[PDB]
């Protein structure tokens, strides 16, 4: 029972905790203790082959009963352990005797009653290891201490068979290529099914539009439910004119023949509900450092996970589906893009069968019927999203004690976060305790549900983000939780959340797969990259076009009104006449809607803002979910709402209106917002998120310049570039690139001198990769895009087919004269949306990456002999306009520009290595061109999240990455600040590690008031293996991914970003490439940059604490460079940061201060008083050395007890009164006596005895505090008047 000396602190890598910061009566610390030893070989267990997960981990969890010890000791207030608590080895314990009433009988010397018979559960309980420890606000003495299997400390270790990859890198036995486990061929015309295509409007209604089109008549969308079971009458969304191509078998998405060895959990959520002794357990125990029966237990509740389960909503049983349905479900299917919302396909933990169920097939609705009106009804479903093992204990941490009861928030997912596989939390578990913490009910509620209520008005940063949901929950939020926590009086949730996914919006033409591998692997799952590619020669003129309405123009020459190959230059006039005579005009009715012959036609910004779940002003308003992310890609911190959380009920009651549709009769007329059922509850859950935000308060390209500003940890150098023609570009923002052009030349050139620019001269830096006739012309560009469908001709305007006839015939052509000088991956219009690419969605996942450092980049030629890019002579900066700027406008990461990042990295250059590594991206002139994205080389990833620090009453942090993120300005925003100060890790060993995470061991604040997080440069854990024994191409590490090729046709000598870069088929290039997909893997990358081993030298050991920069109030000022006289906000921004280049400091960024420590670093143990690395340091409380009790044979009992224990101290307040104390305490000569008090906590009339706790002001902190060396017991004694029997 006592203190055990072989136990060190620890800390656990899915939540980070390692002690708890007693407060109140007895304050100290419950820190974590665990066996250091060695020689724990866990592959002394041998899995068979017929025995189940099951069996393996008990046997596995009996092994480490035996070599493995685990205990939470309890701290004084001076770090001084008292106690181990070790559960498996505490010898009969007891729960805590209680009241009628629930109270547990308690005396303060004597202790807590124990009942003598062990707490329930006892015999599968013993065995778990402790993870955290969190107090109750309002009762004494009552703590909660949560309890996980040994396993899931030890999951990383299990062999690679039981716990395996979603990607495999194979024998390699015929060379590597990334598309091999991506299917691609296109779907081709059926030629059996060819006159069930749309119909085209027989006849276009006037009904007094006089407005009148030559062009191609609307579509024909007729649904009405008719009468017969199981059909409809009509069921024009059904129809289905193509199919998958037949080539060595059929090529669709089929598990069976794919994931051969499937990657499957652990354990599924019902095994984790039956098994007790595998689910997380958290139990409530009563606990007194000075007393006699110092601790005992009281409820033990299991984390039951069907208890989450239970409350999905039930639109989450058929995952595979939509709100949408039987549309876009065949859309998704023939685009080899997995369906529905949260497709396992693309999210394979969540599902007890894993990849297993990874396809479209048995969708939960019926579809594939060979008759088209068949198609569309409610049916079995067999592939509901669950809670298995990895997602579980990624579920389970950061606690939180609120009132009655106690929520677990989950944690970062590192428990069980592999290589290619994201386990996150999910939703948030809540234990309510009744009558006084006697019983308790478990039960938890999933964070869609949640969040739903976010609204644009809430967060100060980014607006427009894909973070909303609707009636049906398909948006599937789940947080990477860096903790929760009172920041003051506000309670915060932080950490980093999965937005709707933002990069397979836009969808690619039906024979259009073949040479956009990339985007279509994103869409497919293959590819975990959530970043958008920018890849739009192949977009689809509108995503939510059904397949009915694809073949309608075959040849291509019309350029189909209805589908064609996406681009903004041949798009419609917004114009009343144009309207009138082609959208107005089809008027659409509860059975009817049109597929309209107007040329619908944007880049990716229009695609987003009309087909992403952007937020809006109202919550559930978010008509077009497509699916989300895979990796968290943005931050998030919110402040929830307490009362609220406490006062929701258990169970949640979802209605027909969280259904699906039952039949497409009944879908058509889907209406967006319907009034819940009377008896439901689920829309009570919506408005926890008081508000939120994601990151700095910056808004549109000011954000893309902070981006900017921020550096790269991977050698320190801005991503701008800045300080020093041809010199390097920035990477992000557009000021100073290109050349300026005026938006009022472009689209209808009127009514913009003043609309979008206050500036009196509107001129917009057009960015790299522009567009002009020439430098005389370099103010908007004429039509001279026109897209040729063959070689045939320009695209034609002022033909009869592209011309509207308004009131009395006086026809004009629908396509604007002049428009925007880019189309570029880095173009930025606030003047036409439908051009402009930037947007917030990707500047959120830019800052996100960024900060992590792992931006992919384009690259054609590696730093082989005879295949090197040439930093000179071969890379023009002023030419951005031509080949020479080596800008590929295909396949890069949206937003950026390939060699501003390749620069930055230096790829090329001496920028990062000595010698220049000679990577880069060439675009090539003289033939074709291929090329492949590839990683920075650092392995950070987004869910590497650490503890949350609060630093104050207003201010929050945690480490993120390689970086500490403090949140200065969330809770109580100021106007002109950036809210956000970055402090980077300064070892480079760290920084450039294989797997960097494994080093970080927990952060916390300071007695001094900044936080610190733990290092330890000795922990880093190398990858499985040394590629066994033969060079393995794929070698997986957190930060890889399956970047496919990308082959483009020549690039023009001169206009060369005039129309998109037109890619070709791309499906045989990987064997010509051989060079660059050996850059795939990170280390490689390393090793040309230099940092492949411990070439990267400098500490050898190093162990330390890195601490986050020193900030003051006017750090985080950018008034001066936000605001506008004499510009627009992003240049002065660009201006300002330009201008503090040399004093990133006062704008939030610098490198943290790093201190070494000698020795392993474990944890640190933290009491109110000071902080414990690995409980290394204790004093003897030096303030109070010369305080301590009189001893009895020093006290006149008669002098003092002669009146009675009742006016010795006052019973209002049970503190005994000023003129007494110095007659029972020791004290030196001269001490202020008004600065000790004596906190009376028993007495008896009856026997005349008095129980005493001491305290004395603090100095240091102005708050009384116990003194520890008042007596040799403790700060605790009995006074009686010798009746002491």
């Known amino acids: 029972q006592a203190v055990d000396e072989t136990l060190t602190p620890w800390t656990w890598n899915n939540n980070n905790f390692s002690s708890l910061k007693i407060t109140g009566e007895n304050p100290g610390s419950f820190g974590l203790v665990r066996s250091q030893n060695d020689n724990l070989n866990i592959s002394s267990v041998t899995k068979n082959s017929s025995d189940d997960n099951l069996k393996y981990l008990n046997a596995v969890e009996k092994y480490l009963d035996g070599q493995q010890n685990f205990a939470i000791r309890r701290y004084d207030n001076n770090g001084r352990a008292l106690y181990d608590i070790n559960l498996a080895k505490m010898e009969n314990p007891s729960t805590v005797q209680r009241g009628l009433n629930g109270e547990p009988i308690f005396d303060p010397f004597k202790g807590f009653g124990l009942t003598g018979n062990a707490p329930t559960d006892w015999n599968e309980i013993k065995g778990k290891v402790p993870v955290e420890v969190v107090q109750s606000p309002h009762s ?268 677990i928030f989950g944690g970062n997912g590192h428990a069980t976060k592999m290589f290619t596989t994201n386990p996150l939390s999910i939703g948030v578990f809540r234990i309510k305790y009744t009558d006084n913490f006697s019983k308790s009910s478990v039960t938890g509620w999933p964070y869609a549900v949640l969040f739903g209520g976010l609204i644009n008005p809430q967060t100060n940063g980014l607006k427009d983000l894909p973070l909303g949901t609707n009636r049906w929950f398909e948006y599937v939020p789940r947080m990477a939780v860096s903790g929760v926590k009172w920041v003051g009086n506000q309670l915060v949730l932080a950490g980093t959340l999965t937005m709707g996914d933002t990069a397979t919006v836009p969808r690619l033409k039906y024979d259009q797969l073949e040479k956009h591998l990339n985007l279509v692997a994103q869409g497919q799952g293959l590819l975990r990259e959530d970043l958008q590619i920018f890849t739009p020669y192949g977009w689809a003129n509108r995503p939510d076009i059904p397949v009915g309405a694809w073949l309608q123009d075959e040849m291509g020459s019309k350029f189909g009104p209805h589908y064609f190959l996406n681009n903004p230059d041949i798009q419609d006039n917004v114009n009343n006449d144009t ?186 830096w057009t960015g790299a990769g522009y567009r002009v006739q020439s430098a005389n012309q370099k103010n908007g560009i004429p039509f001279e895009q026109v897209k040729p469908s063959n070689n045939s001709t320009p695209f034609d305007p002022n033909s009869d087919d592209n011309k509207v ?89 949206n937003g950026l520009y390939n060699a501003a990042l390749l620069h930055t990295y230096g790829f ?195 162990g330390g604490v890195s601490q986050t920069i020193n900030t003051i109030t006017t750090t985080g000022n950018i008034s001066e460079g936000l605001k506008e006289e004499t510009s627009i906000q992003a240049e002065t921004l660009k201006k300002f940061f330009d201008s503090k280049q040399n004093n990133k400091s006062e704008i939030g960024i610098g490198d943290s201060t790093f201190t070494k420590m000698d020795g392993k670093l474990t944890g640190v143990v933290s009491t109110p008083l000071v902080n414990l690395i690995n409980g290394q340091g204790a004093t003897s409380d030096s303030d109070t050395e010369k305080i301590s009790f009189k001893p009895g044979n020093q006290i006149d009992f008669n002098r003092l007890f002669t009146l009675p224990v009742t006016e010795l101290f006052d019973p209002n307040t049970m503190f005994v009164y000023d003129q007494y104390v110095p007659l029972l305490v020791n004290l030196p000569s001269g001490f202020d006596q008004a600065s000790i008090r004596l906190k009376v906590i028993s007495y008896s009339v009856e026997n005349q005895t008095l129980g005493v706790r001491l305290e004395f002001k603090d100095p240091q902190t102005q708050q009384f505090i116990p003194v520890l060396n008042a007596s040799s017991t403790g700060p605790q004694t009995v006074f009686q008047p010798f009746n002491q029997w």
Not at 257 to 286: C, H, N
Not at 665 to 686: G, H, I
Not at 712 to 728: C, E, L, M, Q
């Open 140 to 407: 004494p003495n009552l703590y909660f201490v949560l309890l996980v299997p040994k396993v899931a400390l030890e999951y990383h270790n299990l062999n690679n068979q039981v716990v395996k990859e979603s990607l495999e890198v194979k024998a390699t036995q015929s060379s590597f290529n990334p598309t091999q486990r991506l299917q691609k061929d296109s779907p081709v015309k059926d030629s059996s099914k060819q006159g069930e295509k749309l119909s085209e409007t027989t006849a276009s209604s006037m009904s007094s539009g006089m407005a009148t089109s030559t062009r191609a008549k609307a579509l024909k969308v007729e649904v009405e439910r008719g009468s017969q079971s199981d059909s409809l009458l009509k069921n024009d969304f059904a129809k289905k004119p193509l199919k998958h191509k037949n080539s060595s078998g059929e090529v669709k998405l089929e598990a069976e023949k794919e994931f051969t060895e499937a990657w499957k959990p652990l354990l599924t959520t019902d095994q984790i509900a039956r098994e007790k002794g595998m689910g997380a357990t958290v139990v409530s125990f009563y606990d007194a450092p000075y007393s006699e029966n110092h601790t005992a237990f009281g409820l033990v509740d299991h984390i039951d996970p069907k208890k989450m389960v239970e409350n999905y909503p039930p639109s989450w049983k058929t995952p595979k589906w939509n709100h949408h349905g039987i549309w876009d479900y065949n859309a998704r299917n023939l685009l080899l893009q997995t369906t529905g919302f949260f497709n396992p396909r693309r999210h394979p933990e969540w599902f007890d069968e894993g990849q297993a169920k990874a396809d479209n097939t048995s969708p939960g609705f019926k579809v594939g019927d060979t008759d088209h009106k068949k198609d569309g009804f409610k049916k079995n479903s067999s592939s509901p999203i669950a809670l298995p093992f990895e997602a579980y204990f990624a579920n389970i941490g950061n606690m939180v004690a609120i009132g009655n009861s106690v929520f």
């Open 579 to 764: 309207v009138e005579a082609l959208i107005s005009s089809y008027k659409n009715t509860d059975k009817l809607k049109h597929v309209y012959p107007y040329r619908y036609s944007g880049l990716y910004a229009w695609q987003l803002f009309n087909w992403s779940n952007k937020l809006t002003n109202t919550p559930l308003s978010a008509n077009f979910v497509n699916e989300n992310s895979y990796a968290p890609n943005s931050l998030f911190a919110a402040i929830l709402n307490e009362d609220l959380l406490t006062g929701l009920s258990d169970k949640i009651f979802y209605g027909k209106e969280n259904e699906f549709a039952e039949n497409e009769a009944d879908r058509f007329n889907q209406l967006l917002s319907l009034n819940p059922n009377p008896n439901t509850n689920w829309a009570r859950y919506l408005n926890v998120v008081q508000r939120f935000t994601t990151g700095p308060n910056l808004d549109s390209s000011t954000f893309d310049q902070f981006l900017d500003f921020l550096p790269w940890i991977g050698n320190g150098k801005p991503f701008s570039n800045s300080p020093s023609s041809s010199t390097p570009l920035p990477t992000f923002s557009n000021i100073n690139v290109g050349v300026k052009s005026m938006i009022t030349q472009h689209l209808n050139k009127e009514n913009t001198r003043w609309v979008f620019i206050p500036n009196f001269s509107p001129d917009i």
């Open 805 to 893: 006839t308004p009131s009395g015939g006086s026809s004009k052509p629908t396509t604007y004269p002049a428009l925007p000088n880019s189309i570029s991956p880095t173009s930025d219009w606030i003047n036409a949306l439908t051009f402009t690419n930037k947007n917030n969605p990707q500047r959120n996942q830019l800052l996100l990456r960024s900060l992590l450092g792992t931006i992919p980049v384009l690259i054609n030629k590696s730093g082989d002999s005879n295949d090197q890019f040439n930093k000179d002579s071969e890379q023009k900066w002023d030419k951005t306009e031509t080949n020479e700027g080596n800008l590929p406008g295909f396949g890069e990461v």
């Open 908 to 1102: 090329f250059g001496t920028n990062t290595n000595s010698t220049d590594p000679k990577i880069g991206f060439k675009a090539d002139s003289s033939s074709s061109s291929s090329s492949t994205l590839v990683g920075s080389g650092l392995n950070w990833t987004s869910q590497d999240v650490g503890n949350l620090v609060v630093i104050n009453d207003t201010s929050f942090g945690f480490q993120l990455g390689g970086w500490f993120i403090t949140f200065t300005d969330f809770i109580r925003p100021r106007t002109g600040y950036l809210g956000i100060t970055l402090s980077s890790l300064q070892d480079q060993t760290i920084i450039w590690a294989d797997q960097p995470w494994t080093s970080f061991k927990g952060s916390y604040l300071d007695s001094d008031g900044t936080p610190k997080s733990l290092w330890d440069p000795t922990a880093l854990k190398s990858l499985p293996n040394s590629s066994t024994t033969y060079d393995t191409n794929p070698t997986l590490s957190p930060s890889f991914q399956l970047y496919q090729p990308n082959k483009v046709k020549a690039y023009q000598t001169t206009n060369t970003y005039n129309k998109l870069i037109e890619p070709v088929d791309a499906t045989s290039a990987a064997t010509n490439m051989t060079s660059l997909l050996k850059l795939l893997t990170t280390k490689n990358i390393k090793a040309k940059l230099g940092k492949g081993t411990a070439s990267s030298q400098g500490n050898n050991n190093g």
